[PDB]
Amino acid sequence: GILQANRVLLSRLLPGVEPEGLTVRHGQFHQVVIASDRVVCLPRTAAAAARLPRRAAVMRVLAGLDLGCRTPRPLCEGSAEGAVELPFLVLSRVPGAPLEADALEDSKVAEVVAAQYVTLLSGLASAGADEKVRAALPAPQGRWRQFAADVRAELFPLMSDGGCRQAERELAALDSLPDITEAVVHGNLGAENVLWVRDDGLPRLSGVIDWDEVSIGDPAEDLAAIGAGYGKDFLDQVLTLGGWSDRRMATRIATIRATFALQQALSACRDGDEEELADGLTGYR
Amino acid sequence: MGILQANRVLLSRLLPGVEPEGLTVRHGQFHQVVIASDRVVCLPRTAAAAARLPRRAAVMRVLAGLDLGCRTPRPLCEGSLPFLVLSRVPGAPLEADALEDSKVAEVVAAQYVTLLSGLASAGADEKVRAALPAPQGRWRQFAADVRAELFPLMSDGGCRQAERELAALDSLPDITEAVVHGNLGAENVLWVRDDGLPRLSGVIDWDEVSIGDPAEDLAAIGAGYGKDFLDQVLTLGGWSDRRMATRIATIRATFALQQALSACRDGDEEELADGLTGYR
Numbered sequence: 380g381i382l383q384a385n386r387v388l389l390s391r392l393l394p395g396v397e398p399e400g401l402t403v404r405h406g407q408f409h410q411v412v413i414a415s416d417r418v419v420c421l422p423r424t425a426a427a428a429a430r431l432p433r434r435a436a437v438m439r440v441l442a443g444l445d446l447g448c449r450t451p452r453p454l455c456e457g458s459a460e461g462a463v464e465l466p467f468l469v470l471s472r473v474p475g476a477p478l479e480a481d482a483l484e485d486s487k488v489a490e491v492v493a494a495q496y497v498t499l500l501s502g503l504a505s506a507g508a509d510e511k512v513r514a515a516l517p518a519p520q521g522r523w524r525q526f527a528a529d530v531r532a533e534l535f536p537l538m539s540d541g542g543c544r545q546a547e548r549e550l551a552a553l554d555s556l557p558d559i560t561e562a563v564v565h566g567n568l569g570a571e572n573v574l575w576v577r578d579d580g581l582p583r584l585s586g587v588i589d590w591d592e593v594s595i596g597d598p599a600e601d602l603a604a605i606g607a608g609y610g611k612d613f614l615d616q617v618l619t620l621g622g623w624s625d626r627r628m629a630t631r632i633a634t635i636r637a638t639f640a641l642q643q644a645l646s647a648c649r650d651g652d653e654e655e656l657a658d659g660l661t662g663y664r
Numbered sequence: 665m666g667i668l669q670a671n672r673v674l675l676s677r678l679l680p681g682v683e684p685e686g687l688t689v690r691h692g693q694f695h696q697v698v699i700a701s702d703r704v705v706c707l708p709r710t711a712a713a714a715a716r717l718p719r720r721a722a723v724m725r726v727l728a729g730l731d732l733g734c735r736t737p738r739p740l741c742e743g744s745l746p747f748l749v750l751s752r753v754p755g756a757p758l759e760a761d762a763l764e765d766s767k768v769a770e771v772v773a774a775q776y777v778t779l780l781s782g783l784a785s786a787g788a789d790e791k792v793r794a795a796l797p798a799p800q801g802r803w804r805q806f807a808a809d810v811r812a813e814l815f816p817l818m819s820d821g822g823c824r825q826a827e828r829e830l831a832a833l834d835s836l837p838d839i840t841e842a843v844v845h846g847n848l849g850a851e852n853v854l855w856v857r858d859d860g861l862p863r864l865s866g867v868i869d870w871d872e873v874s875i876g877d878p879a880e881d882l883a884a885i886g887a888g889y890g891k892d893f894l895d896q897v898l899t900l901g902g903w904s905d906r907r908m909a910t911r912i913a914t915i916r917a918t919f920a921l922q923q924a925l926s927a928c929r930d931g932d933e934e935e936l937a938d939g940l941t942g943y944r
């Protein structure tokens with residue numbers, strides 16, 4: 380296992396912690412070891428090791444944004460960002476748990492939850508208009524054109540003909556999408572990455588995790604994720620409160636949202652997560 | 665009425681559905697702080713503290729950006745009575761009795777080094793230097809306050825000793841190379857425990873933060889944990905030159921006078937008595 384293989388390193392980083400009682404989340408590039416108060420990104424390849432300096436810079440930049448919540452703070456020293464390669468990266472662990480959709484059936488909760496989503500997305504939107512932020516995060520072009528190519532290459536082989544025709548209609552609108560690079564975009568903002576303390580009182584946003592796919596891009600990508608997980612009414616409430624309920628934005632959201640399962644499937648494919656891949660491919664095979 | 669009742673409107677906004685009478689309120693030199701599970705709300709008492717709260721929020725923003733190897737209180741929300749919501753760093757202080765175990769002591773010393781390195785490094789960053797106070801000849805203004813306010817409370821001997829201590833303090837070089845927490849006692853350093861050896865969670869109470877001499881934070885560590893443990897920290901960090909030992913000792917021996925001067929102004933006669941122990 381990953382915990383077994385990196386036993387010696389983990390014992391230095393987490394002294395006196397039994398690596399039996401640790402969790403592991405799979406990434407495309409990093410295996411992230413989850414401890415009580417912190418997470419250890421272990422590179423899967425030397426190429427992955429070479430990306431961790433940049434990642435440390437990215438997470439530092441995110442930790443200084445005004446999002447109204449926490450983010451995984453890098454626990455390396457600043458000079459780590461100057462390295463060719465890192466053998467690991469330690470980040471603070473954001474406390475709290477995800478929110479089941481059930482909770483949003485209460486009207487006051489939904490109001491409160493939507494409001495804090497808005498704060499977060501407004502923070503991200505404004506941060507993506509900052510030249511120092513834009514300079515530190517990736518901003519790939521024709522990502523939608525390219526993403527469609529990656530689905531056809533990497534996911535169609537796992538699909539039925541029916542699933543492939545379904546995917547094709549969904550990929551069809553992508554080539555028409557405007558290529559927007561205006562906001563900081565988490566890129567995988569499903570419910571499991573948005574952590575709440577519902578200890579005392581109504582749900583209060585603790586923070587946001589799993590920034591692997593972060594970029595300067597289109598805010599509709601993150602609103603789509605929320606739409607996918609929580610449905611139309613809750614989305615609409617976020618759009619109203621944030622002032623993003625225009626037809627142009629809504630159109631983009633709907634187009635991206637229709638691809639969101641495929642986004643999760645492509646991710647699960649690349650990071651070897653089999654149950655996430657099965658879920659994402661639900662109705663495609 | 666109560667502080668919680670008094671601020672109940674704001675608390676219902678900031679902490680929706682949270683029973684205000686279930687919260688706690690700690691105090692300080694400038695701020696009333698309401699403690700909730702995962703965050704605190706800073707309220708100013710003085711009209712001056714209300715005006716300075718924007719600056720402190722911008723400072724905490726900068727601190728939340730640095731690489732210190734641990735958490736700091738992240739600004740979540742500011743508004744106008746002005747308020748500032750900060751994250752609650754989890755964990756508790758480490759009892760000095762923990763340092764009796766030498767494997768614990770090594771790990772703690774190591775983590776302190778990382779913190780102080782981060783603080784040191786940050787001092788060089790001009791962005792940080794701009795957003796943080798860099799008061800020149802701070803130690804001399806202090807000495808004048810001591811003479812003005814404390815000498816009259818003191819014996820002739822006390823004044824001899826104190827004057828000797830302020831003399832040493834004037835001869836110190838005016839150093840502004842590092843971010844200096846300013847108040848780095850055991851209470852403001854929080855740890856994760858009962859999951860292997862103590863891991864540094866984060867640091868709080870940055871109100872006295874400045875660009876200055878790192879010997880100030882190192883003295884504070886030594887005050888709280890003793891000179892054996894500080895020596896461990898000084899060796900790991902490569903700070904065990906005698907110039908540094910001098911600045912630390914000079915600064916260390918002003919803590920009684922600092923406490924007394926604080927207690928004098930605070931009208932906190934218990935502290936003033938303890939601070940002046942030996943000076944009267």
Ligand SMILES: Nc1nc2c(ncn2[C@@H]2O[C@H](COP(=O)(O)OP(=O)(O)OP(=O)(O)O)[C@@H](O)[C@H]2O)c(=O)[nH]1
Binds near residue numbers: 692695752754
């Ligand atoms: N866990 C946690 N506790 C905090 C935090 N901020 C304040 N506290 C607690 O609330 C108290 C309030 O005191 P300070 O934060 O020092 O108050 P202050 O008046 O702003 O500070 P000074 O001007 O330096 O005296 C602290 O001593 C802690 O007990 C925080 O971010 N996390």
